[PDB]
Amino acid sequence: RPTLPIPDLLTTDARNRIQLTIGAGQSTFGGKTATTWGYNGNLLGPAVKLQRGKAVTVDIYNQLTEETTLHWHGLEVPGEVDGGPQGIIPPGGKRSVTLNVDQPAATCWFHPHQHGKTGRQVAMGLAGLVVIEDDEILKLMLPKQWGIDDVPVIVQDKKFSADGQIDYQLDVMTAAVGWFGDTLLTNGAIYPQHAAPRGWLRLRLLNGCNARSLNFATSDNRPLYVIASDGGLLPEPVKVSELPVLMGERFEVLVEVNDNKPFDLVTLPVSQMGMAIAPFDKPHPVMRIQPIAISASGALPDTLSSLPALPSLEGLTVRKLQLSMDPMLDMMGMQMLMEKYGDQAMAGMDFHHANKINGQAFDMNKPMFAAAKGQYERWVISGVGDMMLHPFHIHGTQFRILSENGKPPAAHRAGWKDTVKVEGNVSEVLVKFNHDAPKEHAYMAHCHLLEHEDTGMMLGFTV
Ligand SMILES: [Cu+2]
Ligand SMILES: [Cu+2]
Ligand code: NA
């Protein structure tokens, strides 16, 4: 098996700057070369390392021949640097943003947010990681040797043409159910192996799929110890046998490497339209882990962090966000799926503006509302009226989930989150915005099934 590629850990220079170049190159997948896009490379991108309380300047060079934007998913930053659809970087052009990092240690990420083209641009290869550290997490003595016992694991599906090229389309089927493929990549590689020291192994898991939800486990059912969600450390580890992960979510887990036997990280079949088609109808390997006897000192602590209590609900502003899809899209989309795959498509169970929030397809010129600054609000996000999956992402914030799709959040989902599950039911988040966003550089809130977002399931808001 190819060894697991490790994104380079990219830190500030002597002048407190970092450079990111967005460009096209070539990658090879199962023998065939394909045109791919990457940050500082051909595919995917580096892990940008930031420290809480320290400002960095990022110089972004768009070396594509089309426009793009750069969104820091999970970062509590002003709208001006948030890199939503209004953050255009012209082809051949350079844009610089200042990130004044002020949030707990977390694994966040970054990716394009081009208006109507976000799905395509991510599918082409654009994504990178953000490793935020603070004064608290380094006290914990977690595994910390980057690319040895502290390893990013970015999992993504793709579909390829006969000629080997990435086979991406925004059409009626994908507008409805998403873009998904038959080939699983792990940091850009197909079924790689990673050499992990005996002791504790830390995985920073990112579901970087456009539309595919995942569910991590191990081939021999050894447990995962969840230590962190989107926006950082949980209060204490949560021990699980499997870990569902929605599109754009991150969890950090420890896994015990307590003998010499190789095992796989795997993903288990999910109940989502289109996602349990072969070979995802069965547990699917993600990467092979090969235990090795080299130095490690990482441990699993009893106690990780202390988070604030949930705010009192009395007197909070309530915002209702109703998600919907044009009936025609739903049936048309389903028709194409059934035509393409047949009964397998339901196993485990103008379209360009057919996806909506509060009866409106995204209008870039009209923020739906102004949210309060520095005050908790309760946002109620409903998917009642359809049975599609919607990982709902709110920019500019790490929030607390009050209810997820009908129930209190699972323990490992009760900490800091930038995404909440909405699937035929209603969710509630308690959300606070510590930074401003004007109408000209508004925050986005949207489904992170990218083809839904691209076809209207998004709103802008100011702070
Ligand atoms: Cu985001
Ligand atoms: Cu959606
Ligand atoms: Na504990």
Swiss-Prot record:
Compartment(s) of residence: Periplasm
GO molecular function terms attached to this record: copper ion binding; ferroxidase activity; oxidoreductase activity, acting on diphenols and related substances as donors, oxygen as acceptor; oxidoreductase activity, acting on metal ions; oxidoreductase activity, acting on metal ions, oxygen as acceptor
Residues at which Cu cation 3 binds: 113, 395, 446
pH dependence: Optimum pH is 6.5 with 2,6-DMP as substrate. The pH dependence of the reaction as monitored by oxygen consumption shows a broad activity peak between pH 5 and 6 and a second activity peak at pH 8.
Effect ascribed to mutating residue 76 to F: Increases oxidase activity with ABTS as substrate
Cofactor(s) of this protein: Cu cation
Domain Plastocyanin-like: from-to ranges: 25-135, 197-262, 350-463
Induction annotation: By CueR, in response to increasing copper concentrations.
SUPFAM superfamilies from the UniProt entry: Cupredoxins
Effect of gene knockout: Disruption mutant is slightly more copper sensitive on complex medium than wild-type strain under aerobic conditions. Deletion of the gene does not affect copper sensitivity under anaerobic growth conditions. Deletion of the gene leads to elevated biosynthesis of enterobactin under conditions of iron scarcity when copper is present.
A single GO BP: response to copper ion
Residues that bind Cu cation 1: 71, 393
Listed name of the protein: Multicopper oxidase CueO
Taxonomy of the source species: Bacteria, Pseudomonadati, Pseudomonadota, Gammaproteobacteria, Enterobacterales
Gene that this polypeptide is encoded by: cueO
